[PDB]
């Protein structure tokens, strides 16, 4: 059934599962034409496919050439996502394949189910959570690499860096969702919080700064404040 507040710790059991977000697959800028009409120009996008237990981020870059000459691109994007997810699973060995795929938007259910007919023992599930994975393109290294691609490409990151050496996957996922929720509500403030202290660096292979445990607590607190605020600055409370 649907993944929600009540069955949240299931994400961190030992059954392999992937979270698929398609928000950033089809991305456009909207502009005026010389005649004063409106047109779209596509830009590179990405499928965000994440193992929430291990932190593996399988980032399939969607190059704008895949849209050339195609119609109804928002609908195609869901089928392209499902095609690429099915291909990733088929490549994986049987023991490394996921038993569940949770899609963050309900409109991905039928495209993924059809592309996975060959895998009847993989459950495709929606979720009732309003997860902030759309903000993955606010992660500097992600925004930069998806925009530099000149061809379709599969990019790999650990979205938890080395956190699992010190914290559990439940705690790492909670930290990720807070950082991403913050970046989604106010990207400027969020990024200021993360990079204010020049002495804390980002390792070449990491997405986030090398915070100590104590510094993460401060950081996590500041991100909570941001989100409560922006909720005030938005709802005047």
């Amino acid at each position: 059934g649907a993944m929600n507040s009540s069955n949240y710790a299931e994400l961190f059991n030992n059954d392999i599962k992937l979270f698929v977000d398609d928000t950033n697959v089809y991305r456009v800028t909207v502009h005026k034409t010389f005649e004063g009409n409106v047109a779209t120009k596509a830009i590179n996008g990405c499928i965000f496919t994440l193992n929430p237990k291990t932190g593996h981020l399988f980032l399939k870059i969607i190059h704008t050439s895949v849209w050339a000459g195609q119609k109804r691109l928002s609908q195609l994007a869901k089928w392209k996502t499902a095609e690429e997810v099915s291909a990733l699973v088929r490549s994986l060995p049987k023991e490394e394949q996921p038993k569940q795929i949770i899609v963050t938007r309900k409109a991905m259910l039928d495209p993924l189910e059809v592309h996975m007919l060959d895998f009847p023992n993989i459950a495709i599930r929606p979720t009732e959570l309003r997860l902030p994975f759309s903000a993955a393109m606010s992660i500097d290294k992600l925004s930069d690499v998806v925009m530099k691609a000149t061809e379709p490409q599969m990019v790999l990151f650990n979205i938890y860096d080395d956190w699992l050496d010190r914290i559990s996957s439940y705690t790492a996922f909670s930290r990720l969702t807070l950082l991403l929720r913050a970046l989604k509500t106010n990207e400027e403030s969020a990024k200021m919080i993360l990079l204010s202290d020049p002495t804390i660096t980002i390792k070449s292979y990491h997405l986030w700064p090398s915070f100590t445990d104590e510094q993460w607590i401060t950081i996590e607190s500041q991100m909570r404040d941001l989100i409560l605020t922006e909720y005030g600055r938005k709802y005047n409370v």
Partner: protein, 300 residues
């Protein structure tokens, strides 16, 4: 004109014959139905006055034998039987007509309703859906489940309709996932029409039989089958023009005949609004769209 005699009417029962019906009181001197048109299948069906649970009945074709009804007090129902002794049967029927203890199949001459509802329905195909080969006629009731329903429990008593499943490998060619799922023409035209049914007449015949079992017995699996077969055509971009014209006539007469008070359970909002307003065939079912809008505008 053929006749279905009754041995007797020991229990109070509503008897239907095709779209007609009449009430028979307990131990009323009823001895059957005469003047039944030859050339069409027919259904004779029953609802007991005590237990309106279980509508049941028999599909039959008078050209395939002499058939009669006899109540069984052990199994508690009116049973169809074949009489093999031809002279015994003509003799029984003639005596009952003489004493005028048979009702007359009350077909108005202008009326083509039953023909229009059973145009493509054949006994031989009914008998492969309802498997009971020692009999020339077929029993159906409200509770019988379909083979597809049983995949999701007694097989001898199942409705073996053709399984349609839009999210199945049969329906979806590898490499055409989006194409085949959004445009079901290859599943309609190649898998089902060319492959399984052979021609559109057989497809229409099963569609019509499914509707009639849904209407006369409230058989839910049959209603699921009728809507699935509709939806498969409506969700195909490429349909022979002759099939679309005939489908419009088929559904027109089904919607015309449906009791106004059963439409809440027997009509699936989603399939109909898709057929009539979203699907490829939103512009191809003019007669059906006009009767649905004037008779069931709430559904839409």
């Amino acid at each position: 004109m053929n006749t279905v005699p009754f041995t007797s009417a020991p229990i109070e029962v509503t008897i239907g014959i095709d779209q007609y019906s009449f009430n028979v009181k307990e131990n009323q001197p009823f001895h059957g139905i005469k003047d039944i048109p030859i050339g069409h299948v027919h259904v004779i069906h029953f609802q007991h006055a005590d237990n309106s649970s279980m509508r049941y009945g028999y599909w039959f074709d008078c050209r395939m034998g002499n058939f009669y009804i006899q109540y069984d007090p052990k199994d508690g129902l009116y049973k169809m039987m074949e009489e093999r002794d031809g002279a015994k049967f003509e003799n029984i029927v003639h005596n009952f007509k003489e004493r005028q203890m048979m009702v007359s199949y009350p077909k108005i001459d202008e009326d083509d309703t039953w023909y229009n509802l059973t145009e493509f329905v054949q006994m031989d195909k009914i008998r492969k859906i309802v498997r009971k080969d020692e009999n020339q006629f077929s029993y159906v009731d409200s509770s019988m489940t379909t083979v597809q329903e049983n995949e999701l429990s007694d097989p001898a008593h199942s409705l073996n309709y053709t399984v349609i499943n839009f999210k199945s490998r049969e329906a979806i060619r590898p490499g055409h996932e989006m194409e085949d799922f959004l445009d079901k023409s290859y599943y309609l035209n190649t898998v089902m029409l060319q492959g399984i049914f052979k021609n559109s007449s057989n497809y229409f015949g099963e569609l019509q039989f499914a509707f009639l079992n849904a209407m006369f017995f409230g058989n839910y699996g049959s209603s699921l089958q009728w809507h699935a077969m509709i939806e498969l055509i409506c969700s195909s971009a490429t349909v022979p023009k002759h099939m679309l014209d005939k489908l419009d006539e088929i559904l027109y007469y089904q919607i015309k005949t449906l009791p106004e008070q059963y439409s809440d359970i027997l009509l699936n909002e989603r399939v109909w609004n898709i057929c009539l307003y979203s699907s490829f065939q939103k512009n191809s079912l003019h007669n059906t769209e006009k009767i649905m809008e004037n008779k069931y505008p709430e559904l839409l």
